[PDB]
Design a protein around this ligand. Structure first.
Ligand SMILES: N[C@@H](Cc1c[nH]c2ccccc12)C(=O)O
Ligand SMILES: [K+]
Ligand SMILES: [K+]
Ligand SMILES: [K+]
Ligand SMILES: [K+]
Ligand SMILES: [K+]
Ligand SMILES: [K+]
Ligand SMILES: [K+]
Ligand SMILES: [K+]
Ligand SMILES: [K+]
Ligand SMILES: [K+]
Ligand SMILES: [K+]
Ligand SMILES: [K+]
Ligand SMILES: [K+]
Ligand SMILES: [K+]
Ligand SMILES: [K+]
Ligand SMILES: [K+]
Ligand SMILES: [K+]
Ligand SMILES: [K+]
Ligand SMILES: [K+]
Ligand SMILES: [K+]
Ligand SMILES: [K+]
Ligand SMILES: [K+]
Ligand SMILES: [K+]
Ligand SMILES: [K+]
Ligand SMILES: [K+]
Ligand SMILES: [K+]
Ligand SMILES: [K+]
Ligand SMILES: [K+]
Ligand SMILES: [K+]
Ligand SMILES: [K+]
Ligand SMILES: [Mg+2]
Ligand SMILES: [Mg+2]
Ligand SMILES: [Mg+2]
Ligand SMILES: [Mg+2]
Ligand SMILES: [Mg+2]
Ligand SMILES: [Mg+2]
Ligand SMILES: [Mg+2]
Ligand SMILES: [Mg+2]
Ligand SMILES: [Mg+2]
Ligand SMILES: [Mg+2]
Ligand SMILES: [Mg+2]
Ligand SMILES: [Mg+2]
Ligand SMILES: [Mg+2]
Ligand SMILES: [Mg+2]
Ligand SMILES: [Mg+2]
Ligand SMILES: [Mg+2]
Ligand SMILES: [Mg+2]
Ligand SMILES: [Mg+2]
Ligand SMILES: [Mg+2]
Ligand SMILES: [Mg+2]
Ligand SMILES: [Mg+2]
Ligand SMILES: [Mg+2]
Ligand SMILES: [Mg+2]
Ligand SMILES: [Mg+2]
Ligand SMILES: [Mg+2]
Ligand SMILES: [Mg+2]
Ligand SMILES: [Mg+2]
Ligand SMILES: [Mg+2]
Ligand SMILES: [Mg+2]
Ligand SMILES: [Mg+2]
Ligand SMILES: [Mg+2]
Ligand SMILES: [Mg+2]
Ligand SMILES: [Mg+2]
Ligand SMILES: [Mg+2]
Ligand SMILES: [Mg+2]
Ligand SMILES: [Mg+2]
Ligand SMILES: [Mg+2]
Ligand SMILES: [Mg+2]
Ligand SMILES: [Mg+2]
Ligand SMILES: [Mg+2]
Ligand SMILES: [Mg+2]
Ligand SMILES: [Mg+2]
Ligand SMILES: [Mg+2]
Ligand SMILES: [Mg+2]
Ligand SMILES: [Mg+2]
Ligand SMILES: [Mg+2]
Ligand SMILES: [Mg+2]
Ligand SMILES: [Mg+2]
Ligand SMILES: [Mg+2]
Ligand SMILES: [Mg+2]
Ligand SMILES: [Mg+2]
Ligand SMILES: [Mg+2]
Ligand SMILES: [Mg+2]
Ligand SMILES: [Mg+2]
Ligand SMILES: [Mg+2]
Ligand SMILES: [Mg+2]
Ligand SMILES: [Mg+2]
Ligand SMILES: [Mg+2]
Ligand SMILES: [Mg+2]
Ligand SMILES: [Mg+2]
Ligand SMILES: [Mg+2]
Ligand SMILES: [Mg+2]
Ligand SMILES: [Mg+2]
Ligand SMILES: [Mg+2]
Ligand SMILES: [Mg+2]
Ligand SMILES: [Mg+2]
Ligand SMILES: [Mg+2]
Ligand SMILES: [Mg+2]
Ligand SMILES: [Mg+2]
Ligand SMILES: [Mg+2]
Ligand SMILES: [Mg+2]
Ligand SMILES: [Mg+2]
Ligand SMILES: [Mg+2]
Ligand SMILES: [Mg+2]
Ligand SMILES: [Mg+2]
Ligand SMILES: [Mg+2]
Lengths: 17, 46, 271
RNA sequence: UUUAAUGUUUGAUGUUCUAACGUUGACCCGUAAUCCGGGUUGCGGACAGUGUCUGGUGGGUAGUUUGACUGGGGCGGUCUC
RNA sequence: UUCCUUGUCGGGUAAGUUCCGACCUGCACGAAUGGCGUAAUGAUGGCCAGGCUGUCUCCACCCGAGACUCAGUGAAAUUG
RNA sequence: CGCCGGAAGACCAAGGGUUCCUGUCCAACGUUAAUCGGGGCAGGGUGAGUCGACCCCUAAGGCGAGGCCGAAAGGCGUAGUCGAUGGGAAACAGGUUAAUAUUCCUGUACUUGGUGUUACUGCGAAGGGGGGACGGAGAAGGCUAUGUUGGCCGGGCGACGGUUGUCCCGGUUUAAGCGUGUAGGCUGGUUUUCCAGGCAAAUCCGGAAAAUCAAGGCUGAGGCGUGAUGACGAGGCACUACGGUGCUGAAGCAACAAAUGCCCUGCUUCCAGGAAAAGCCUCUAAGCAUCAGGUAACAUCAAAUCGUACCCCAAACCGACACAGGUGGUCAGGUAGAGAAUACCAAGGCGCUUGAGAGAACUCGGGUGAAGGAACUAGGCAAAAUGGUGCCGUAACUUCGGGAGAAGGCACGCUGAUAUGUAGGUGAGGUCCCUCGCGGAUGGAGCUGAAAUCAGUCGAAGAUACCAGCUGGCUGCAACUGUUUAUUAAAAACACAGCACUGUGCAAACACGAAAGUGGACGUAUACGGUGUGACGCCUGCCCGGUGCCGGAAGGUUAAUUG
RNA sequence: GAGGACCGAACCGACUAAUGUUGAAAAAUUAGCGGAUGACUUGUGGCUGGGGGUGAAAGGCCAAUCAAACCGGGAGAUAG
């Protein structure tokens, strides 16, 4: 749960710093 | 791969059995709560 | 003798071993053995109370005679043996009445030599007397601190004590640390130094050689995180603080002795 | 005003002592027991150690604080008359 | 570890911001939070050559498993 | 027909618990249908003196009368008492059910107790001594399981050329026990006299002295004999309710090869120096002494209770699933091979619970490719290549070991001869000795059998398949083998041997605990703790002003207390 | 006949790439890769408990949960 591993993977998720 | 539950009835009883609950003051608190609630199986015994 | 191994492997290049051809090649004397289980540095609470201890080889305790209270009966050294529990070597001695015991082997002692204990014993290495019968200046070992209690000083390989002075009921000894101390003159001591004096010339050579002796690896405090040691933290290698033990007390210089009841026996602390 | 001699503490210091207290010294008994207790003796001894009070030290541990305005915030400047 | 900076000079390439050798103008190395070397070792970092090749010029054909049609069973995210 | 065969076969422990076997049913369950099923329903099935548990004995550890300690609850711990993953008596072969079998049946065995009779007699423990009783590696020697070939026995004479022979197919098995005592291994034997030792005693163990003897003893695989004129046995015959059931039954030998099993808890060596207690043997104490008790033979009785089906690399256990995952031990055939690798097979077991077509793009997994050959790309990523045995040959540098399998190169099939099968291994009959035996010497039948050389011969290719290093040059970092972010980081990070500083004199410092206590350590400064650095080589310069630590104590300031 | 020696299966690991990403699988498969007599690996049992343990040190691990586990309570915490 929470995943959807691509909603945890932070290259995919944290794309705009 | 290896999971977390590896059964063994010796350690199941030496940890959670009736005679292990009765051996300490807090173990006898657990048994008193399960009797008050009304549980059919008090402990993991047989 | 010390011998250097040849470098036929990276783990043999730096090994130096001490080989004594005159130790016993056989099983030890069974009646004087006991069981010695390890601890891992854990007390009766199950907690680690000394770090870097754990593993090693199985060992059997040899009941060594530190009191030497079999007075007046001569003994003959039967053999020299290996003891895993101490750095020195033990000897097996046979008394004229048929009793066998283990004693710490002094320097120069070999199979066939005669030893004796008591007030009438001769002044030769291996003999045990009260220290009021030992001439001043002598080099003694296996010294008692309280009469009749058994030897506690100068028990490690190559160590000894010097009787510096005698005054009434006390003698002044110079301990191996270079520290003067007064003991009662009715305490016993064995004449001579402890053997195996080349024990310090050995080189373990590899990291597994110290795991054979029951010593687990040490992690530097400066390589931890701040929650673990007071030295931890930082990007790159940072120290910027005074060295301390993992429980916060200052090391490198601070003095920890506080014993006011045995301070009367210290003539002079070491330097 | 100074001084001593006098008897006393009462303090301070020092040296002896033993009887409190310590003993993870030896021996004996309960006892079939390296716990404990009692006994005999040795060594220390009014010290050590513990309670109450007290000065110091104390990120070892804990609870918290670390302003606003602002052509985004920080940096700088300002904040009342 | 050097910002200026692809410093300059030499080597290697037809051509080399990387690599190797030097120089010293060290923004901002340096001596047990060690300095400088070092044989052997490393699923360690950089660079060069030989062999080898569908990596590529630049793709073509073939062999199987799906994709497609028939019968049977039969989901899911999502949705004013 | 295909697949596994160091398993995808067989047997267990753990775990599960009726999934086991028979009859019947097909609603739901089964990724489809189902007449089938580990599904529904009903019935049946688990047989022990010897296997396991229970039992006797202990390890780590637990609990713990008194005790010590703590506001209470409680903590620790002595005597004790539990606790196996370890020590302790005893059974094998064949037969049989649909389903159990070392449990039932047939044959042949063995163990420990009680009771009784007879004979002789010093018995007796909570105590003493022995024993149990113990590491890593290495090297063999002697064997066996097992396999292969030959002989023997039974059958065969071949769908298509040939096949009465140097031919083909199948079998050639037998245990525990009991008797003997061998290859090997260890040890000197016997008797007497004395003794500060073994908490007391001792005739036992330990020690001392003398005489005498050159042998004795302990242990020990295998073989042989018996067990066994038995059982089993290829087939044949007779029935079949077609699955099976009944009867009879030949030969049942030798040579060679050979274990990772056994002798072997041995032997040799090394350092890191390698459980405990009981069962067992023995010695006495108090005690008892026409007894009791002990030894032996015989007879008799007893050996209770619980497990036992079935699955166990799995559709039955752990993963929500009939889930490409995980799961300890035992067994271990053939042909090639060094091999438990790899290829093809045996015993045995399976084809993985949707199929049928077609033969588009694209995706996945593979094969081949003209000329070129890294031009691709962040980067030779990925692929291709190399790859075996024997011999020749091999640089810088080096800590003298290495580097190094450096690099590179040559030979390799089959047939014949040397030699009707050699060198080597094994070793019968026979002859002689004596020790008349599980012996020694000689001898060489038979069996097995590399490597090489010469000569010939086939292909494009002889390490033919599977299997099986790419290599070299310069350089940074870390000496090295290790460890690490289970599940995006394996590294230059952590560790490390070595080095230094520092604390610690033993009721040690130090750590866990209101404490008692415990670890450090049954250790003692050549030891122990902390800190930093990190093999080895050459080395490690100046600053004590700041912060810290160590020493000092004169003077200044300074708490409770006093008043 | 030594060795934290060498090559290499079982065994223990996890260096690369492709597949998969509502998977066959809440971390695997395929092909290669490392160690493989040791600071090894594994079975059965035991001990350490939450500001605590353990850690060849990564804030790693403590039942698919970790810069402070899980369960119940204070508790209907508080929320400009
Ligand atoms: N994507 C992979 C790996 C993965 C598992 N859990 C993840 C969480 C986050 C990122 C990746 C993963 C998978 O699904 O198997
Ligand atoms: K014993
Ligand atoms: K360290
Ligand atoms: K750091
Ligand atoms: K006293
Ligand atoms: K005091
Ligand atoms: K703006
Ligand atoms: K504004
Ligand atoms: K710099
Ligand atoms: K150039
Ligand atoms: K040029
Ligand atoms: K270096
Ligand atoms: K590496
Ligand atoms: K390199
Ligand atoms: K059906
Ligand atoms: K299903
Ligand atoms: K057992
Ligand atoms: K006895
Ligand atoms: K004797
Ligand atoms: K059964
Ligand atoms: K190779
Ligand atoms: K690695
Ligand atoms: K690390
Ligand atoms: K030290
Ligand atoms: K101890
Ligand atoms: K200074
Ligand atoms: K200073
Ligand atoms: K100063
Ligand atoms: K070897
Ligand atoms: K183990
Ligand atoms: K917590
Ligand atoms: Mg340490
Ligand atoms: Mg160290
Ligand atoms: Mg870190
Ligand atoms: Mg801190
Ligand atoms: Mg820095
Ligand atoms: Mg704070
Ligand atoms: Mg503060
Ligand atoms: Mg608050
Ligand atoms: Mg603001
Ligand atoms: Mg602004
Ligand atoms: Mg240039
Ligand atoms: Mg350069
Ligand atoms: Mg630096
Ligand atoms: Mg600096
Ligand atoms: Mg310096
Ligand atoms: Mg420095
Ligand atoms: Mg350097
Ligand atoms: Mg379709
Ligand atoms: Mg359809
Ligand atoms: Mg929605
Ligand atoms: Mg096959
Ligand atoms: Mg059922
Ligand atoms: Mg069935
Ligand atoms: Mg159906
Ligand atoms: Mg079935
Ligand atoms: Mg059924
Ligand atoms: Mg207790
Ligand atoms: Mg018991
Ligand atoms: Mg069956
Ligand atoms: Mg005994
Ligand atoms: Mg015939
Ligand atoms: Mg015939
Ligand atoms: Mg014909
Ligand atoms: Mg035949
Ligand atoms: Mg006992
Ligand atoms: Mg299951
Ligand atoms: Mg569930
Ligand atoms: Mg299936
Ligand atoms: Mg499965
Ligand atoms: Mg396995
Ligand atoms: Mg195979
Ligand atoms: Mg078959
Ligand atoms: Mg196709
Ligand atoms: Mg081409
Ligand atoms: Mg062609
Ligand atoms: Mg070509
Ligand atoms: Mg290019
Ligand atoms: Mg390009
Ligand atoms: Mg590659
Ligand atoms: Mg060269
Ligand atoms: Mg050489
Ligand atoms: Mg050379
Ligand atoms: Mg070569
Ligand atoms: Mg560089
Ligand atoms: Mg390294
Ligand atoms: Mg490594
Ligand atoms: Mg990771
Ligand atoms: Mg990755
Ligand atoms: Mg990784
Ligand atoms: Mg230390
Ligand atoms: Mg370092
Ligand atoms: Mg000071
Ligand atoms: Mg190795
Ligand atoms: Mg491997
Ligand atoms: Mg790992
Ligand atoms: Mg991988
Ligand atoms: Mg793999
Ligand atoms: Mg390799
Ligand atoms: Mg290997
Ligand atoms: Mg080891
Ligand atoms: Mg961090
Ligand atoms: Mg959870
Ligand atoms: Mg977890
Ligand atoms: Mg918190
Ligand atoms: Mg409230
Ligand atoms: Mg609320």
């Amino acid at each position: 749960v929470t995943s959807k591993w691509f909603n945890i993977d932070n290259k995919i998720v944290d794309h705009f710093p | 791969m290896k999971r977390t539950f590896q059964p063994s009835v010796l350690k199941r009883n030496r940890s959670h059995g009736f005679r292990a609950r009765m051996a300490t003051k807090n173990g006898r608190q657990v048994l008193a709560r399960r009797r008050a609630k009304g549980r059919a199986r008090l402990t993991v015994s047989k | 003798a010390v011998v250097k191994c040849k470098p036929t492997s990276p783990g043999r290049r730096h090994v130096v071993k001490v080989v004594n051809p005159e130790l016993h090649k056989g099983k030890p004397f069974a009646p004087l053995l006991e069981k010695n289980s390890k601890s891992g540095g854990r007390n009766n609470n199950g907690r680690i109370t000394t770090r870097h201890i754990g593993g090693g080889h199985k060992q059997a305790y040899r009941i060594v005679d530190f009191k030497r209270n079999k007075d007046g009966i001569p003994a003959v050294v039967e053999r020299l043996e290996y003891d895993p529990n101490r750095s020195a070597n033990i000897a097996l001695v046979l008394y004229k009445d048929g009793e066998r015991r283990y004693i710490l082997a002094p320097k120069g002692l070999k199979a066939g030599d005669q030893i004796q204990s008591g007030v009438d014993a001769a002044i030769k290495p291996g003999n045990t007397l009260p220290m009021r019968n030992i001439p001043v200046g002598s080099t003694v070992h296996n010294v008692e601190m309280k009469p009749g209690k058994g030897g506690q000083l100068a028990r490690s390989a190559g160590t000894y004590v010097q009787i510096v002075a005698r005054d009434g009921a006390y003698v002044t000894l110079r301990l191996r640390s270079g520290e003067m101390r007064k003991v009662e003159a009715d305490c016993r001591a064995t004449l001579g130094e402890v053997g195996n004096a080349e024990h310090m010339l050995r080189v373990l050579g590899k990291a597994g050689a110290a795991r054979w002796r029951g010593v687990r690896p040490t992690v530097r405090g400066t390589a931890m995180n701040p929650v673990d040691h007071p030295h931890g933290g930082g990007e790159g290698r940072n120290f910027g603080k005074h060295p301390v033990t993992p429980w916060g007390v200052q090391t490198k210089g601070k003095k920890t002795r506080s014993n006011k009841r045995t301070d009367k026996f210290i003539v002079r602390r070491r330097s």
